[PDB]
Write a protein that binds this ligand. Structure first.
Ligand SMILES: Nc1nc2c(c(=O)[nH]1)N(C=O)[C@@H](CNc1ccc(C(=O)N[C@@H](CCC(=O)O)C(=O)O)cc1)CN2
Ligand SMILES: O=c1[nH]c(=O)n([C@H]2C[C@H](O)[C@@H](COP(=O)(O)O)O2)cc1F
Lengths: 315, 292
């Protein structure tokens, strides 16, 4: 239910402990939460604020083809991953622009500096889009989601195709209590841009409906969780389609759920708006496998949200 | 609360989905479930039925010490993990086929026999303290995370995983307790356990006590107060011939939990033994016997 996501946000606002975080921004936070979304009751794309389904749609596609380089996201005009690639870049020997230490916060503080940033980030983007060698070096975020989903590296010079394996298991072994996918690779976690927040997920089959639980170690509640919800609903639907099942529930389970302190006002304005109907998701029936979908194959129809509420992303 | 666990047994009898499998076992289950235990209210040993604290503490001390060999467990009268060890020996070259008591004695007295026959391969001890990397190294998750709590309490990365997709397809007993996360605030240590598969009458009691004990041990080691243990379930199943038991348990009135007393004259929990963990004021209802 939309109300479930809203109730969490309210609860964090109302009874969240204040907490310093890796980004030095400041958060309000709980530990341990669970919300359920019945997918039969609408595709859970938030209606109390416009959420851009395109960006969700193309980040997931990016996950599904194993890709960890942001060039693909740039091609489809998705900048939601840029900052971490930009951070790697500025901190390398190859960057000789103006100083960028702590840019996450400084572009909020100083307007002149935000022009300096706006420029350098632009150049970064264009370099990624056009120089292949640059792209190869500075578009790469490490063995994040696509790598662990598609290409978990084995001790003996090979790789496990975790997503595929589990889709196949749904088909032949639906009562399996082992239908798990993990992004959490201890080996790789030091070398990733950010260790997987949406960390592990598990599937369940009952009476011809597929349900999914995701275990999220860390949830940015205003900016993060709207995306994640929609992302995992999509994936459940796409897997349903393949495996010929109907949709069950998404269960979203959180460790540290938190509100960035400069999202407090946004969440407040969000909380005063009236919930509307979730839209309907329509898939292209011609496409056979989860790995076969492209962006024009997934649409959400009947989506009438309240206006965008903008907020700054904590780097 | 204890009543949080009892809600789950009740919900499964009320609305759990029945499933019969390739082995013939019937189960009523649900999918996705969160319980909370505030450990300042008392250590979560179920009062509605005796839960034996001896085996849980030997098992968890075994897990914490990296051990994957049953010698330790045997020294302490914990037989939980005999079976795969005795199976392998009965198939081995030096057997001349009452006999389980002679294997056990072998494991206890002959050091050479043990480093050969009491060894289980990939289990919690291996997963928590010895995750093999590609090059041949090993990662000590539990350790690093202990270090992480000390130096960086605010970290959102306080994770231990027992789930390796390379290892799972070939392992006899893939891990039920799939991963868990620590979180620190206001000097209190909390723990959430994601568990992919849950035996509600039999497993879940044992489970709640193990992870609460760990939360206390880690707490004690990093010098902190305990907070909550949050228990999250994937597929949570009541076995078809545990139903009458569950009904009997649901009649009994709830009593206050006991109080965990740890021994203060020992600094590291890495030198903890059975005598350093005791439970005071434990007053449960009688055991409810039930087929494993
Ligand atoms: N602090 C933080 N870091 C994170 C995440 C996060 O949610 N929070 N992520 C979580 O996945 C990843 C990146 N995901 C993101 C998801 C949404 C937006 C975002 O800014 N959405 C806006 C902008 C949309 C637009 O401009 O068109 C919005 O909807 O307001 C950014 C990153 C990795 N790092
Ligand atoms: O899928 C994701 N969802 C999400 O909410 N984050 C957010 C959560 C948190 O605000 C930050 C991660 O920082 P840390 O690793 O320090 O928790 O990114 C990241 C992802 F990759």
């Amino acid at each position: 239910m939309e109300e479930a996501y809203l109730a969490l946000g309210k609860k964090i606002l109302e009874e969240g402990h204040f907490k310093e975080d890796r980004t030095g921004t400041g958060t309000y936070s709980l530990f341990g939460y669970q919300m359920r979304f019945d997918l039969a009751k609408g595709f859970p794309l938030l209606t109390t604020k416009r959420v851009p389904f395109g960006l969700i749609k193309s980040e997931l596609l990016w996950f599904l083809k194993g890709d960890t380089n942001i060039r693909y996201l740039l091609e489809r005009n998705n900048h939601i991953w840029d900052e971490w690639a930009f951070e790697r870049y500025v901190k390398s020997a190859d960057y000789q622009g103006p100083d960028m230490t702590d840019f996450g916060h400084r572009v909020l503080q100083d307007p002149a500096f935000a022009e300096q940033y706006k420029e350098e980030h632009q150049k970064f983007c264009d370099a990624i889009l056009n120089d292949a060698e640059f792209a190869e070096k500075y578009g790469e975020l490490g063995n994040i989601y696509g790598a662990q989903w598609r290409h978990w590296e084995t001790k003996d010079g090979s790789f496990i195709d975790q997503l595929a394996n589990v889709i196949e298991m749904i088909k032949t072994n639906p009562d399996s209590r082992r239908l798990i996918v993990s992004a959490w690779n201890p080996e790789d976690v030091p070398s990733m841009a950010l260790p997987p927040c949406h960390t592990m997920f598990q599937f369940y089959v009952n009476e011809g409906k597929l349900s999914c639980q995701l275990y999220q170690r860390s949830a940015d509640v205003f900016l993060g969780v709207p995306f994640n919800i929609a992302s995992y609903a999509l994936l459940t639907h796409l897997i349903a389609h393949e495996t010929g099942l109907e949709v069950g529930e998404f269960v979203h389970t959180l460790g540290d759920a938190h509100l960035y302190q400069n999202h407090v006002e946004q969440m407040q304005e969000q909380l005063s708006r009236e919930v509307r109907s979730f839209p309907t998701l329509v898939l292209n029936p011609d496409k056979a496998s989860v790995f076969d979908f492209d962006m024009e194959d997934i649409k959400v129809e009947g989506y009438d949200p309240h206006p965008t509420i903008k907020a700054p992303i904590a780097v």
